[model samples]
Target: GASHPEIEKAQREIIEAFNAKPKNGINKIKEICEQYKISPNEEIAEFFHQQRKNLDLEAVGDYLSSPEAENQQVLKAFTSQMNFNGQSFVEGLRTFLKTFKLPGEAQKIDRLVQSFSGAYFQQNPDVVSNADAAYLLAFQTIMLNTDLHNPSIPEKNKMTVDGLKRNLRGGNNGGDFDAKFLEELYSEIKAKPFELNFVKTSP
Candidate 1:
């Protein structure tokens, strides 16, 4: 797969920017934000307020696994810019654009990383109280390899029942997640309706 030259050049520059941290690397950010008049707060708020409120990595994992239009457009439009961690955003785009030559590895390149990031974000709402907090946590988790479950954020984000249902449509199959394990579990269940086990039955 031939790499896009424009994206390639941009990535080269980005690599330098990402690696060159003169003030904890924030000075570079300061200069750019000053010129662009971009408020990180507003951007982060837009994601916190406008997004589905509870975006699940487990959910988006399947969305990418299937590569649909509805979820794809929503994801592309939002993630195209600031709706993600700065580094993860770059890496995600890299994953999107990069052409892996392996038999099937290219298609599945970024799922584990993206899904894990999405999972951690959906679980921890108040931890990302502000844009700065979001960036810190997001980068720490995705780029720095911080354990998402290590800090154990309090449950501030909540998803509606319907939202939960919608997210489960693809089931829990993706990323580093054990698809075979889930497959076997489903097979063991023998097509039984497990929903009834959780839902109350009429007396």
Candidate 2:
């Protein structure tokens, strides 16, 4: 009967950001979703559409509803930042992170994550490694929410979360990215201080 911790955290972040600056965080996002006739009741599935080759709200609606367009944007941006093919990477990583048990599988998960670093790097010769992508996308999705456009998360608050995401992104490099490894990653992130620790897997 309890809501997920990550989702609750996200709710807090949005509210905090919105309360700080209605123009950037809350009202703006609500305005956008309303204009499109989209509701926050949309379903969110971990399955990404291969056809879309990226995260898509329209396509996602077919399976589960997404939160509002704003949350959806955060989700999409998170995935996009991950693998070039945002949908797949996010889905894969999300599933992996969400499913693994941090209490027991920490080390194994990390080794598993490390193994993928090569594959990710191989796919993009220009980039140093897949970890690079993971760092930015993963960090931004949960931690970074600066309102360059102004999401209303106060500059100080946003910066802290931004740094958290940045640190996670940076940690991904030259490191492993397996289920066991990321199990710890998830836990560590979940433990981050205040708003920086926010994460939401809700729809």
Candidate 3:
């Protein structure tokens, strides 16, 4: 049987709430699960708990010293400009995806996520907002498309998606731009991730 779309939608909203502020986000998930009468497995519950911790640590880490966090005064000055750029970039990608007819709800979400991820890197506006958008896209894709229990899917892919959730939320140890990771993530999300290193450099 196909998965319940209502349950999926509820999960989507739950993740959005979590992404908005992961500190107390687990409550929202539990509330959502209660509303849907969906019993989250031990793993799912633990996953969200760990995500909150990891994300909080990363945010605090960014403030502690990352170059991205270095110029808050400048960012504060141009925040409005950054936001305008981000929103414009977001709308452009959303519009571009509309032209392609996606056949299913999963495909449509794949488009939405890819567009947001595209905006994440392309706009390059306010790194924090870009990261937030990326996390939201990844979380939605995980809820809508990934099946952690399905045996048909590759274990590696499942692992990638799980790591992906945290990675998007600023948990990556490799900083913000890991091309190889993006390659796997894009493939899983059904985004046609461009292959940049296919050709060997050595002659």
Candidate 4:
């Protein structure tokens, strides 16, 4: 991924402003947003607010100052890492699916993970240790599953396999996965839809 100077600068400023706890901290963040062309939103503010609440200042500061702190993507990755709370990749994926109310059967989720890990490692054998790739694949797969099978979504608005491929390709980090791998996963899901045992209905 390309470096984002503005995001890096904003991260630094936000961390510093957070620690100082000056009356102008909020304004400083907003100022950084304006200066960096980032829209001022509660989500962005919440990320900063969360830092104070959790008191992960030192860790966050280290990440922001590190060479890896290049863009919002990295920041998002950091947030996910924090949320995982030391769970293994599959454990984190399962918890994330449950927390977000995505449908999944335990065995089916494990099978999907196995399939993803196999294809991902085959394509990039060097990064066998990098679980992030598998995590992203699992994440996108669950998203696609929800879009394809969730009864709550109108049938006419449901995503097609082609649409899924297009979306994955167009997404910020989809280029990491091979096209053939994505196609195979899409075909598998279409053939046998993910088990939807816990359907949500509105009153």
Ranking of all predicted structures according to lDDT, beginning with the best and ending with the worst: 4, 3, 2, 1
Model 1, position 11: C-alpha lDDT score: 38
Runs in model 3 with CA error above 4 Å?
1-90, 105-108, 125-132, 135-203
Candidate 2: tens digits of C-alpha lDDT, residues 63-166 = 22134454444344333334433333434445434422222233333332342343344444443345555544454433422232255556464344334444
What lDDT tens digits, residue by residue, belong to model 1 across residues 1-203?
22233323343343344345312222333344455676432232223223222332233333333344433443433343333343333333234322111113324324323433453354344323333333332332232222212246443333323333343343323212134432332333222211111111210
Shift of residue 58 alpha carbon in model 4, Å: 35
Clashing pairs in 1: none
1-203: candidate 4 lDDT, tens digit per residue = 22135544556565566556532444665566677677544334355434444434433333232333132333343333334444433334444333222222454344334434544444445533344556556767677666777778898897776666676563423344456656777766555555433423410
Choose the strongest candidate by lDDT: 4
Error of 3 at 98 (Å): 2.2
List runs of model 2 lying over 4 Å from the truth. Answer: 1-89, 98-103, 126-159, 165-203
Query: Residue 87 lDDT in model 4?
Result: 42
lDDT of 3 at 199: 12
Q: Which segments of model 1 are wrong by more than 4 Å?
A: 1-55, 83-106, 110-203
CA displacement after TM-score superposition, residue 31 of candidate 2 (Å) = 62
